Amino acid sequence: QHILKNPLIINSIIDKAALRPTDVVLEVGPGTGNMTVKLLEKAKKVVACELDPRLVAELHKRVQGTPVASKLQVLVGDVLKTDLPFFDTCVANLPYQISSPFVFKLLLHRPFFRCAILMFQREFALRLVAKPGDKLYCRLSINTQLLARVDHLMKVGKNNFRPPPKVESSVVRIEPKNPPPPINFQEWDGLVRITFVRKNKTLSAAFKSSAVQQLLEKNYRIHCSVHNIIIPEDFSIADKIQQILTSTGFSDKRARSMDIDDFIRLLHGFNAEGIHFS
């Protein structure tokens, strides 16, 4: 666990969070409390999430006897599985291992928050803001960009932590779109996953997987049973997928160069024929 130690960077992160005196702040990875004690002066409540109970006892001691001690609430548990309460804003020092699950937990968290200011590994931050055609453009880029505005805010050298990690870090802002776009994110993610298995290969190739065929055949059976369609004896899911990809012009395209509108068009093409990624 890497403790952020530079006060200029801490002050910079708190400023970008745009705190209001009435805010509930969710602080993930509080460490020893260097950002925590600054948050408590500017916020109505700080909910710090910490898995280690011996860090909890010390963070608590460090604010004990302080006028703001009663504004600290410590959620002891693993953040990915816990039921996060309401908060207005999130600041977080996030280990790489949990960076992707934690972004989608925030994006699907209800009710909506205003802003999250998150510390990530450099590469992870670069994938968050990658654009179509970039070498780092991936599922993570497009899913985050569909659900949120995301900005790369500043680079953070490893010698600002203790102990120093062996990769550089980046601060990122994430603001969820509220309301989120009228896209079934469950189906979206099923489709985006399939196409990014091999993002430099075509979509035609991406759907020839037998795992893909199996999943779409299951869903198609549900569709046909629900609407009393009789599947002809010679029906072929592979042919039908290929027809749709061809009719909508996506057959030869690659996921690495597809933007959000391209995928909305792709998903529309499939759903129109009763093919769901559920």
From Swiss-Prot:
GO terms for molecular function: 18S rRNA (adenine(1779)-N(6)/adenine(1780)-N(6))-dimethyltransferase activity; RNA binding; rRNA (adenine-N6,N6-)-dimethyltransferase activity. Belongs to the class I-like SAM-binding methyltransferase superfamily. rRNA adenine N(6)-methyltransferase family. It is an enzyme of class 2 (transferase). It comes from the Eukaryota. It catalyses: adenosine(1779)/adenosine(1780) in 18S rRNA + 4 S-adenosyl-L-methionine = N(6)-dimethyladenosine(1779)/N(6)-dimethyladenosine(1780) in 18S rRNA + 4 S-adenosyl-L-homocysteine + 4 H(+). Its main location: nucleus. Gene3D superfamilies: 1.10.8.480, Vaccinia Virus protein VP39. GO terms for cellular component: cytosol; nucleolus; nucleoplasm; small-subunit processome. Keywords: Methyltransferase, Nucleus, RNA-binding, rRNA processing, S-adenosyl-L-methionine, Transferase. GO terms for biological process: positive regulation of rRNA processing; ribosomal small subunit biogenesis; rRNA methylation. It is found in: Nucleus, Nucleoplasm; Nucleus, Nucleolus. Signal peptide: none annotated. Its EC number is 2.1.1.183. It holds the Pfam family RrnaAD. Disulfide bonds: none annotated. S-adenosyl-L-methionine binds at residues 2, 4, 29, 50, 78, 93. This is Dimethyladenosine transferase. PANTHER family: DIMETHYLADENOSINE TRANSFERASE, DIMETHYLADENOSINE TRANSFERASE-RELATED. Part of the small subunit (SSU) processome, composed of more than 70 proteins and the RNA chaperone small nucleolar RNA (snoRNA) U3. Specifically dimethylates two adjacent adenosines in the loop of a conserved hairpin near the 3'-end of 18S rRNA in the 40S particle. Involved in the pre-rRNA processing steps leading to small-subunit rRNA production independently of its RNA-modifying catalytic activity. Part of the small subunit (SSU) processome, first precursor of the small eukaryotic ribosomal subunit. SMART domains: rADc.
